[model samples]
Structures are given as C-alpha cells and as structure tokens.
Target: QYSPNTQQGRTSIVHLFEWRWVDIALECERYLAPKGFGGVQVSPPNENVAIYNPFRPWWERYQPVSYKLCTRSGNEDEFRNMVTRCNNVGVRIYVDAVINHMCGNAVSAGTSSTCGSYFNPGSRDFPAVPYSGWDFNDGKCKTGSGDIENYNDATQVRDCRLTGLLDLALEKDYVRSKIAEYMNHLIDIGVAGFRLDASKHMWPGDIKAILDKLHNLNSNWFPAGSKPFIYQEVIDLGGEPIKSSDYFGNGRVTEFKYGAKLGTVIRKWNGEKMSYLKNWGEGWGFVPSDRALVFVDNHDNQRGHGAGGASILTFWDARLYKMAVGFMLAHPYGFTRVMSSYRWPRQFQNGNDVNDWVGPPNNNGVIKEVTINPDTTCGNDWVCEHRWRQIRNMVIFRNVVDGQPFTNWYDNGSNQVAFGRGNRGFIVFNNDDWSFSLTLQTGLPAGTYCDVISGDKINGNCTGIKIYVSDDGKAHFSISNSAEDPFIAIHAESKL
Candidate 1:
C-alpha cells in the first residue's frame, strides 16, 4: 500500500482539487506527464448530494450519496477514460475515497443526488446502493447530539457523525464489504490508488478489514500483484487522543505537522527560523518519512477550516509560498504532493473568509470548464500553482535528485541554509533580512548548471540564473533578500 506504483523517475503528485475528469485526461497528456509529475489526486468520483442552499459548496462532494461512480466531475465513462489515458502515459490517478460517511442527517434527501438517484436522509435509505437504515450508526453512537463534539474521546470521534454527516457502521461485515466493493471497482478501472477521506473517523481494524478486501491494481496498467497505494487522511497535530500512528498499519497517514511546522518556520512564526530546520523530518516529531504524505497546504487547511491554523501558506502569499515549496522539494524528507488550488473571492469578515464555502468557478450552479491561458497557467479562477515557473522547475529538481543522500549541509545559525543531495543536486535558501553571499561547497561535478528555482534549462541554454561550479566543487553564490525567488537550485538534468 505504500508503493505509489508510478513509472520510474517521477517523484511527486499534484492534488488537482475539483478538476473535471475530461480536463484531467487532457492534463495528463498535455502537462502532467510531460512535466514528470507522478500522478493526480482527483476529487471523489462517487455520487454525492447536490446542495443548493449553500449554493453547491465544495464540501458537498464529500457527502457521498451512493457507491456509483458519478458526480459533477464526470460520469463513469469519463472517469474510466481518465484513468486509462493517464496510466497509458506513465502518470497515475488517485481517487479521493470518501467512505467514512454519507450525506448529512439534516439534509432532507429526495432525488437530489448528483447522479439523479433517489435517497432519503431522514430514514437513512439510499436505494441507488440499496443501503437501508441498518447500514448507518444511529444508535451505535453514544454521544447525545449524535455529532463528534469531544476531541478527547476517541470513541465518540469514530462512531459519531462528523458535522452531522451520517457515520457508517463500518464494523458490520456487510458495510465493510460494500466499501471494499466500491474501492475494488476503482482499482479494476485502472486507478493506481486512493486518498481515504476522514480516515480518523474510522476505526483502524475496520479500515484494515476493508483494505484486505481490495483487489490488486489492474494488471493491464500495473505490475502483477501490486497493492494499491493507500494514503489516508488522519489530521493528527499533537494533543489529540487519536494519533496519526494509530492508522500507520493501514497505510501512510497525512503528516499534519509537516506543513504546520514548515510554514511556522518559513513565515518566521513562533520565533522559528529556517536554520532550525536542519533536522526537518523525524527530528521535528513528524511521522516516519516513508509512512507520511506531505504538502504545504490543502483544500481544507488553505481555507483555514482544517489543520495548520494561521501558519499555513497559500497562493495569496505568492513569494513566500514559492520559497516554502522550493525548500520542501529540495529536502529529502517525505513523499511530496503539490497543492494546485483555485482563486476565490477571499473576503475576510472579522477574521474569517465569508466565501470560504464557495465551490469551484461556476455558472449558476454548474462548474465552469477549466480554460488555459496563453502563458500556460489555468484560467477561470483556477490558481494552478503547479504551473508556476518556480514550483514547476522544483518538481523537476526533486525527480532528478531522487534517491540521493542529503549531503553537504550548510547554515548560518539563523534564517540562511543550503544543502545538497549527493553529487546530483544542490539548493540554497535565504530567508533573512540581508542578502546571502558565500562561496559554498556544492557536492556536484564541475559544470555550468541552471538554477531551476528561477527557471529551467531549455535546449542546452540556462533560462535564468546560472551556477558555475569549479573543479574543486565550490561555487560563490549571492542572493539579495529582495530577489524575485530567494532561492537557487541545480540538478543533474539541468547541468549543461
């Protein structure tokens, strides 16, 4: 379950949040595969409730209505087509599997599903999947409000409803079978893996039972007997009674502290400095690197709804955001996933985003088609941070430096730091008030290398800043605090 199963030399995945299946298909051919991205983490593909009162907020996709592969993202045909096309081109697809719960109990259900299936939330009846009241956890939850209110109580957190969404009775053998059937359908359709949404709300043993029922990845696309990559979403950021390690046996858990601490240091919050990150991974109390899935910000935390609190960085902080991402890509810590977000009307009313619940760019209630701008960035409110020159080139840097050791570390005991990955790659960062100027030992061969953090190497020409390493493996580097990108990086692929 830990293996990503991507083709060789690809190192990272991008969460194409809320993207349509047709667009993802085109992206795999035109952008992702060509750029060497490993895979795309797509939104849930199953049927969900269509909420109009909040005018189709993005979270509506999480309230699954049935196991049928149908939603605004696309129909089953489009989903299967996306998986096939992406896999054919060496890029994999990971579906966001929301199996912990279904539509909210208070949401009066009718034929209001995105797939036009009839479901009744009041009586816990979803005929599309033929799930009756017996499948739900109405009486099993001990909490009086039937909702998760006590964070200290692990039982209530798992058995009770999350924000009034109906919790599933996953302990039931039939319930586990149904969830496995939904996942197996996805695996057989050529998907490489899944992102288990709300994994913290499900018991670990129940999750294991469901996972045990999953089929191997399709032999048409994957190696024989390959397990589907299963990275679950368990936001454990210290102090919680339920821990991230509790679900480690099932698969990799999302390291909530990864972004929280990285941002805290990069943004200079809580008296943190970049130099303190010399021991970035397990030294900082994070989970094991191989068993962790890492990101700078996600759809939930970027909106200030999930983890990270005020320390999270997003597209709004463009310069610092790029610098943070550069540091992450350069460091060999955990499996990286880039966040590709959309731009919303971010209006803060009394320290809260009033439009945080707004869905993807849409006309009336229908999602808008993602259009590409002439410069290769996405149009129609899609921020497409993955396309930015700095972030895009760093993704290539990580791929080129894959499996190299973290050698030749340097720091100024404060906000300046530099490091290298064996003789294949080197990177430097300047987060201080003054410029960083030094002749440092870069563990790379003597060559004229392209600094990928600023731009890419095209047809043997360095497009941005160039680093010329001497025969002795030392180079003089200088970066002003006011530089467009306060970092410089060079990898074997970019070396001329």
Candidate 2:
C-alpha cells in the first residue's frame, strides 16, 4: 500500500482540485504523461449534496449523498472514460473516498443530491446505498451534542461526528461491506488507489477491516495481486491524542506538519531559518518518509479550513509558494503532492476569507470547463500551479533524481541554502534579505546545465538561465532575494 504505483521515472502527483473528468482525460494525454507526473488526486467523484444557500460551495462535495460516481465533475461514464484514458497514457488516478460519514444532520433531506438520489439525513436513510439508522453511531457517542467536541479524547475523536456529519458505524460488518462494495466498484473501473477522507475519524482497526474486504487493482492495468494504494487523511500536528503513526497499519498517512513547518520556515516565522532545514525530514518530527504522503498545501488547508496554520503557503503566495514546492520536490523526504487550484472571489474581513466557501468557476452553479490558453496555462480562473514553469520543471527534476542519495549540502547560516541529490540533480535557494553569490560544490560532472526554474532546455538549446559546472564539480550561483523566483535547479535531464 505504501508504493505509489506510478509508472517508472514518475515521482510526484498533483491534486487537480475540482477539475472535471473530461478535462482530466485531456490533461493525461496532452500534459501529465509527457511531463512525467506520477498521477492525479482527483476530487470526490461520488454523488454529493447540491448546495443552494451557499450557492455551490466547494465543501458540498464532502457531504456524500451516495456512492453513485456522479457529481458536478461528471457522471460515471465520464469518470470511467477518464480512468481508462489516463491509465492508457501511464498516468494513474487516486480517488478521494469520503466514506467517513454522510451529509450533515442539519441538512434538509430531499432529492438534493448530484445524482438525484433521495436521502433523508435526519433519519440516516440513504436509499441509494440502502443504509439506515442502524449504520450510524448515535447512542455510541458520549458527547451531549453527539458531535466531536474535543481532540484530547481518542474514542470521541474516532467515534463522533465531524462537523455534524452523520458518523457511520464502521464497526458493523454491514457498514464495512457497503463501503467496500463502493470501493470495489471504483477499483474495477481501473482506479489505482484511494485517499481516505477524514481517516483520523475512523478507527484504524475498522479501516483495516474495510481494506481486508477490498478487491485488488484491476488486472487489466495492474499486476496480479496489486493491492490498491491507500493514503489516509490523518492530520496529526502534535497535542492531539491521535498520532499519525497510529494509522500506519492501514497505509500512508498525510504529513500535515510537512506543509505547516515548511511554511513557517519559508515565511521566516519566529526565528526559523533555512539553515535549520539541513535536517528537514524525520529529524523535524515527521513520520518515516516511506509511510508519509507529503504536500505543501492541500485542498482543505489551502482554504484555511484544515491543520495548516496562517503561515501555510498557497498559490496566492506565488514566490514563496514556488520556493516551498520546489524544495519539497527536490528533497528526498516523503512522497510529494502538488496542489492545483482555481481562483475564487477572495474577500478578507478580520483576516479571514469571508468568501472562502465559494465554489469553482461556474455558470449558474454548473461547473465551467477548463480553458487552456495558447501558452499552456489555464483559463476559467484555474491557477494551474502544476503547469507553472518552476513547479512543472521541478517535477521533472524529481524524476531525474529518483533513487539518488542526498549529498553536497550547504547553507549560509541564514536563509540561503544549496543541496544535491547525489550527482543527478542540485538546487539552490536564496531566501535571505540580501544577495547570494557563492561557489558551491554541486557534485555534478563538468557540463552546462539548464536551470529548470527560470525556463526549460529546448531542442539542443537553453531557454533560460544556464549553470556551467566546472571540472572541479562546482558551480557559482548568484541570486538577489528580490528575484522573481529566488531559487534555481539543474538535473540530469537538463544537461547539455
């Protein structure tokens, strides 16, 4: 389950948040496969509540109405077509499985579902799946409001409702079977794996039981007995009773602290410095790299709703954000995920985005199709951070340096740093308030390498900054802190 199952040489995945199935199919062939991206973490494809009061908020997808593989993204047919098309091009798809609970208890029940599935949230009756009140954890919850009130208690954190959503009684075989059935349906459709939503809310034992019931990856694409890859959303940032390692028996757990800590350091919060990142991985209190799924920012935390604090860097912080993601991809820590987002009407009052709940670009609440500009960027308010030159090229750099040992570390005792992935790749960052002009040991062979951050190496010619590695396996790097991108990277693939 720890293995990402990506095609050879692919190293990172991108969360194309809220993109349509049809568009993702187009991306797999036109961009992702050729760019060497591992896979895509697609938004929840199952049926969900259709919101009106908030006028189609993004979190509406989290409120599952049923597991019908239909939503604003598209119907099951479109989803299946996407899975098949992406897999054909060596790009995998990981579904966001929101099985922790159902729609909020306060939601009025009706045909208010994406697939027109009739569900009465008050009675815990989802006719589509045929789940009833017996499948929920009501009497088992000790909290007076029947909702999770505190994180200090392990039992309440696992057994109670999250944000008033109906908590499923996963201990029951009936509930486990139903969830497994839905997952098997997706697996048979050729999905590579799943990202278990709100996994911290479900018991590790119950999750393992569900896994025990799941079918392996579809043999058409995967090898025989290829168990589906599992990465659970277990946000453990210390001070919480539920530690991330507690869920390792299931599969990889999201390292929420990765982004939070990276953000704090990059933002230079409270005396943090880039020099301190020399021991950035497990030394910084993260899980073992093999059992961790890391990212700069996720769909929830990017919107300020999850574990990441105010320092979390998103696409909004383009300069610092790119530096953070570039550093993440370059370092051999945990498996990395890059976030791609869409623009929303951001209105801040009292340091909070009052319009954070706004949904993707839409026309009368119907999702707008992604529009690709001639230069390869996206339109229709899509940020397409994954397509940016610095990020896209870093993804390729990571691929080029896979399996290479970390070596040639250097820091200026402040915010300037440089490191190499064996001799396959080397990167330098200038986050100080002054200029950085230093000759560092890169450990690469003598050659002229294209700096991927500024641009790409075209047909036998460099399109951006070029670094000349001398016979001594060293290179001189100079960057002003005020440069558009205060980092530079070179790798085996970009050698000229």
Candidate 3:
C-alpha cells in the first residue's frame, strides 16, 4: 500500500496546485518527465460549486457536489487527455478525492453550477448520487456544535461534520459502495492513485474497504493487477485522539508536523543552532519513513487552512523554504512531495477574511490558463516554486541516490551541516552568518562533479559551481551564509 508505483528511478511527486489539465499534460511532456518527477497531485477534478460572492475561493473544490469529472480544471475529455498524455511520458497523476462529504450548507453563488447534480444542503438531499438522509451521519455526531468542536473526542472528530460540511455515513455498506464506485471510475480512467481528502474523518477500515474495491491501475502505465496508490490526509500533531496512525494501515498518512518542525529547525539552523538536525528522521516523532508522505508545505497549511498553524514553510519564505526543501530531499526520510502553487494577490478574499482565500490566477471567477515562460517559469500569477533549480535539481539528486543510506554525516556543532548519500550524492549547508570551509568526507569516487543546486551539468561541463574530490573520498567545500546560494549539492548523475 505504501508503494507510489513510481516509474523507474523517479522518486518525487509535485502538487501542481490548481493547474489546468492541458497545462499538466504539457508539463508532463515538457518538464516533469524530462526532470524525472514521478507524478503530480492535481486539484480535485470532481464537480464542485461555483461561488461567485467570494470569487470562487480555492477551498470550494473541497465542497464536492458530485463525482462527475468536471470543474474549473477542465471537463472529462480534457481530464482523460491529460491522464493519457502524462502517462505516456511516465508522469503519473493522483486525483484529490473528496469522499468525506459533499457541499456544505452555503447557498450556490452561480445559477449554473459546475456539478450537474441536484443537491439540497438544507435537507441533506443529494439525488444525483441518489444519497438521502439515511446516507449521512446526522445522528451519529456527538458534538452538539454541529461541527467538529472537540479534537480530543475520537467519535466527534470522525463522525461529525467538519465546519458544517455534510458528513457521509461510510459505515453503511451503500455509502462505501458509492465511494468505491467513484474511486474505481478514476482508476479505470488511468489515474495512478488518490489523495484521499479528510481520511481522518472516515474509519480506516471503511477506507480500506473502498480501496479494496478500486480497480487495478490501468495496464497502459502499470503492470496488470497493480493496486492504486493511496495516501490519506490525516493531520496528527500529537495529543490528538484521532491520530495519523489510525489510518496508516490503509496507506501513507500526511506528516503535518514535518513542515512545522522543519520550519523551526531551519530557522534555528540559521540562528547558529544546527545540531538538532543530526537526528532528523524517526527521532523527531515522525511516522515510520515508509508509512509517511512528507512535504515542506502544502496548499492548506501555507494559507493556515489545515494543520501546523502559521509556522509552515512556504514559497514566501524564499531562501529558508528552499533550504528546508533541500534538507528534506537530501535526508533519508519519508516519500517526498514538493508543492507547486499559483501566486495569490493580496486583494483576494476567502470568505470574510480578505486575501486569505485567493483562487488560482483567474478571470473573475474562472481559472486562467497557465502560461509557461521561456525560462521554464510560470506566468499568470503562478509561483511555480518547483521550477527553482534548488528544488528540481534535488529531485534528480534523490533519484540518483534513491535507495542509498546516509554516510559521512557532519555538523559543525552549531549551524553548518553536510552529508553524503552513500557514494551517489553529497550535500552541504551553511546556515550561519559566517562562511564555512571544510575538507569533508563525501563518500564519492574521486572526480569532478557539477553542483546541481547552483546549476546544471550542460554537455559534460559544469554550468555553475564545481566540486573536485580527492583520491581519499574527501572534498573541499565552502559556502558563505550570505551567498546567493547557501548550499552545494552533487550526485552521481551530476558528474561532469
């Protein structure tokens, strides 16, 4: 269940937040495949409401209206085109499956909704899927608040409506069948897997049953009988009764604390307190590496919507965020996923909180077509942080040393750290204000290597920084804290 079913040698997935289907298809062919990303986590492709009063905040997609593959991303045909094209280039697609519930109590903002289904949130009536009052968990909610008000109560957290969003009765066999039918449809359409939204709200056994019913991965991209990949969104920060461990038996669970802890540790590293990172993995209270799906920041947490509070690292943090991402990729930890997001204008409003619910760069309420510039960056208000050399290069580095163990680990006892991934890759970071110069053990065979973080290996030449290793497997590496790039990384694939 933990296998991402990634193509040979590719090791990372990028969450292309709110990107269009055509854009994703283009990205798989033009960038993701060439750069060796395993797959993409696309926005909810299912039908959702079109709320105009708030100019269609991004979270509206989470309030699903139906299972039809129609939304701002594109219709079913475009979706199928994207899956086929991306799969052709070995870049898989994982849909965001909002199975926990349907649209909330909010009134429709548009006369013509994107979901071609009937819904009466006032009465808990959704006839399109033919779900009625019995199909919901209206009576099972222990929290009288009508929403999740108590995190300490496992029953309230699991059976209650999240923020008044209608909760489905997954314990019911019919409800499980409906959810399984929806997932099986996506599997048949060639999606490699799913990001099961709000998996914490549903019972793990129910989810496993749903997954058990899903069809095998399409034979065109995966071997016959390949089970679909699944990673549950279970936000456990410790002390919570509904822990991430409850759902690990189904598949991987999102490690929300990873970003918050990385943010804290990276800042401390910058403050000349770097010894803490020496024991970064399971020692830090993260789930077992194989059962965790980790990231520096996700769409919800970046905007303070989900877990980890305001301390989450994001593209706005620039250098520090990149550093944290570099460390995540370099360290032997959980399955890694990098976030790629569209830029939000400060004027955008999410609900009453102005500037919080910014939709993708859009035309009024419509999502704008993503534009890629000549330099491999995104226009049309997309942040496209994954395109940053520090990130994409590390993805290649991870692939180059996919199964290797950490070796030659070193830390200055303060704010300087370096490590090698077996003989395949080595990296160093200078988080302190002072310059660092060290003759460190790199564990690589003596050779000249291109520093991937600084630049690319172009035509057997180092296009940016270069590192030379001596016969003793030692290398002289240096990085000033004030350098434009505060880290250096080289891997076997980056040998010049």
Best by lDDT: 2
| Worst lDDT 10-window in candidate 3 | 345-354
Ranking, TM-score, top scorer first: 2, 1, 3
Model 2 weakest 10-residue run by lDDT: 300-309
Write model 1 residue lDDT over 62-116, tens digit each, in one string: 9989999889889999999999999989999998999999899998879888999
Q: What tens-digit string does per-residue lDDT give for candidate 3 at 1-496? A: 6889889899999999998899899989989999999999999998887766677889889887777888888999999999999988999999899999987865652323575566777777777686888888889987777788987887887789988888998888898898888888888889998899998888888888777777888887799879878899998887877778888788898998888888877777345266678888889898999899999999988887887765678898888888889999988899999999887765535433367787898886777887878888888889888899889999888999988998888988877999989999999999887999989999999999999988999998998989999899999998988988799999998887
lDDT of each: 0.92, 0.94, 0.86
- List candidate 2 segments past 4 Å from native: none
Which parts of model 3 are misplaced by more than 4 Å? 108-112, 269-272, 347-353
Query: lDDT order of candidates, best first?
Result: 2, 1, 3
Worst 10 residues of 1 by lDDT: 361-370
RMSD of each: 0.8, 0.7, 2.1
